[PDB]
Structure formats: structure tokens, C-alpha cells
Design a protein around this motif. Sequence first.
Motif, PDB file in Angstrom:
ATOM      1  N   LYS A   1       1.177  -1.073   0.032  1.00 45.58           N
ATOM      2  CA  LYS A   1       0.082   0.187   0.049  1.00 45.58           C
ATOM      3  C   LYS A   1       1.138   1.136   0.043  1.00 45.58           C
ATOM      4  N   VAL A   2       0.658   2.288  -0.938  1.00 46.79           N
ATOM      5  CA  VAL A   2       0.998   3.755  -0.861  1.00 46.79           C
ATOM      6  C   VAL A   2      -0.009   4.401  -0.465  1.00 46.79           C
ATOM      7  N   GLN A   3      -0.014   5.242   0.512  1.00 47.71           N
ATOM      8  CA  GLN A   3      -1.278   5.795   0.918  1.00 47.71           C
ATOM      9  C   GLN A   3      -1.114   7.100   1.876  1.00 47.71           C
ATOM     10  N   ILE A   4      -1.963   7.897   1.454  1.00 46.95           N
ATOM     11  CA  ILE A   4      -1.788   9.523   2.431  1.00 46.95           C
ATOM     12  C   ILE A   4      -3.396   9.565   2.588  1.00 46.95           C
ATOM     13  N   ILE A   5      -3.487   9.560   4.120  1.00 48.95           N
ATOM     14  CA  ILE A   5      -4.877   9.882   4.534  1.00 48.95           C
ATOM     15  C   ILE A   5      -4.550  11.337   5.343  1.00 48.95           C
ATOM     16  N   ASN A   6      -5.341  12.506   4.550  1.00 53.12           N
ATOM     17  CA  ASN A   6      -4.925  13.579   5.023  1.00 53.12           C
ATOM     18  C   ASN A   6      -6.293  14.464   5.335  1.00 53.12           C
ATOM     19  N   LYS A   7      -6.218  14.826   6.505  1.00 54.42           N
ATOM     20  CA  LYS A   7      -7.655  15.575   6.945  1.00 54.42           C
ATOM     21  C   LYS A   7      -7.326  17.017   7.461  1.00 54.42           C
ATOM     22  N   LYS A   8      -7.923  17.979   6.694  1.00 58.82           N
ATOM     23  CA  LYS A   8      -7.821  19.336   7.392  1.00 58.82           C
ATOM     24  C   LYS A   8      -9.120  19.952   7.822  1.00 58.82           C
ATOM     25  N   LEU A   9      -9.072  20.313   9.227  1.00 53.84           N
ATOM     26  CA  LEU A   9     -10.279  20.877   9.684  1.00 53.84           C
ATOM     27  C   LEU A   9      -9.978  22.250  10.272  1.00 53.84           C
TER      28      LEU A   9
END
Lengths: 9, 9, 9, 9, 9, 9, 9, 9, 9, 9
Positions: A1-9
Motif C-alpha cells: 500500500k502507498v497511501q496518504i490520509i490527509n484531513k484538514k479541519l
Amino acid sequence: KVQIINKKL
Amino acid sequence: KVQIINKKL
Amino acid sequence: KVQIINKKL
Amino acid sequence: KVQIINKKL
Amino acid sequence: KVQIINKKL
Amino acid sequence: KVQIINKKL
Amino acid sequence: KVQIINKKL
Amino acid sequence: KVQIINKKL
Amino acid sequence: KVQIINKKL
Amino acid sequence: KVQIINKKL
């Protein structure tokens, strides 16, 4: 897996 | 796994 | 695993 | 494992 | 394991 | 920037 | 910047 | 900067 | 800076 | 700076 989980609030 | 979990609040 | 868990609050 | 757990509050 | 646990408060 | 540069050879 | 540069050879 | 430079040979 | 430079040969 | 420079040969 190559993955980015990005969450901006 | 290559992964970034990034969370900005 | 290569991983960054980054959390800015 | 290569890992950074970074938490800024 | 190569790891940094960094916590700034 | 949130970025992964992954290169497998 | 949140970044991983991963290179496997 | 939060960064991992990982190189496996 | 939070950083890991990891090199395995 | 929080940093690890790790080199295995």
C-alpha cells in the motif's frame, strides 16, 4: 500500500 | 506499507 | 512499514 | 518499522 | 524499529 | 505539502 | 511539509 | 518538517 | 524538524 | 530538532 490520509479541519 | 496519516485541526 | 502519524491541534 | 509519531498541541 | 515519538504540548 | 515519493527497484 | 522519501533497491 | 528518508539497499 | 534518516545496506 | 540518523552496513 502507498497511501496518504490527509484531513484538514 | 508506505503511509502518512496527517491530521490538522 | 514506513509511516508518519502527524497530528497538529 | 520506520515511524514518526508526532503530535503537536 | 527506528522510531521517534515526539509530543509537544 | 503532504507527499510520498516511493521508488521500488 | 509531511514527507516520506522511501527507496528500496 | 516531519520527514522520513528511508533507503534500503 | 522531526526527522529520521535511515539507511540500510 | 528531533532526529535519528541510523545507518546499518
